Amino acid sequence: KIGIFFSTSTGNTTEVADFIGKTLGAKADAPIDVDDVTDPQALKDYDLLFLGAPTWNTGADTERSGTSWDEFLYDKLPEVDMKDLPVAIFGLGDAEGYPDNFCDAIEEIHDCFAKQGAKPVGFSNPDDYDYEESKSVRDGKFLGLPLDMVNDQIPMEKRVAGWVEAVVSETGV
Numbered sequence: 001k002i003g004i005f006f007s008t009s010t011g012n013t014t015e016v017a018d019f020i021g022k023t024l025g026a027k028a029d030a031p032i033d034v035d036d037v038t039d040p041q042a043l044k045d046y047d048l049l050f051l052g053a054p055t056w057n058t059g060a061d062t063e064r065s066g067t068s069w070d071e072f073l074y075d076k077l078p079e080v081d082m083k084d085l086p087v088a089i090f091g092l093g094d095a096e097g098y099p100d101n102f103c104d105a106i107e108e109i110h111d112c113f114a115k116q117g118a119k120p121v122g123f124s125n126p127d128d129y130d131y132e133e134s135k136s137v138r139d140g141k142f143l144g145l146p147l148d149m150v151n152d153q154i155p156m157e158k159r160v161a162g163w164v165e166a167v168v169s170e171t172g173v
């Protein structure tokens, strides 16, 4: 079973989370907003997790999403043993408004989950979007899939569907 966990402030992330669900069909559970998670142990009942979050707190070291993820990452996640579970991160941002901080929240989610033993998958080509810098680019790769739903430089559906496919291939789920 594949799980989809996200959070949002203005609902853009929700749209993306729903779309992933549609591409996966019966293989995925309906997306769950992190704010709705009582038991963080639920995260472990899946074979693969798609995690999504926007970036709202520009330049912040921690709590970059400005969503329920900010509390969840530090108060709840530390209690979950995620050894070997693959997680694929998608993040929403604005390459035009924040050229130097493009989808910075991806790195935070990546690092927090990695610390729990999770295995990040679904890296993407940092060249897809035009931006100057991001904390989410490491070793020549984006640590997840960045999306710009503000400027729509790249049609969302085709980009996400291709990424989902790559993730399913990589993980064998």
Ligand SMILES: Cc1cc2nc3c(=O)[nH]c(=O)nc-3n(C[C@H](O)[C@H](O)[C@H](O)COP(=O)(O)O)c2cc1C
Residues within 6 Å of the ligand: 007, 008, 009, 010, 011, 012, 013, 014, 054, 055, 056, 057, 058, 059, 092, 093, 094, 095, 097, 098, 101, 102, 103, 104, 149, 150
């Ligand atoms: C106040 C504000 C700050 C933002 N900061 C960033 C940022 O630092 N980096 C980025 O890539 N996008 C930034 N954005 C863009 C948001 O991530 C984007 O609008 C996103 O689609 C919102 O996702 P949501 O509707 O799920 O909350 C910011 C937007 C606003 C309004």
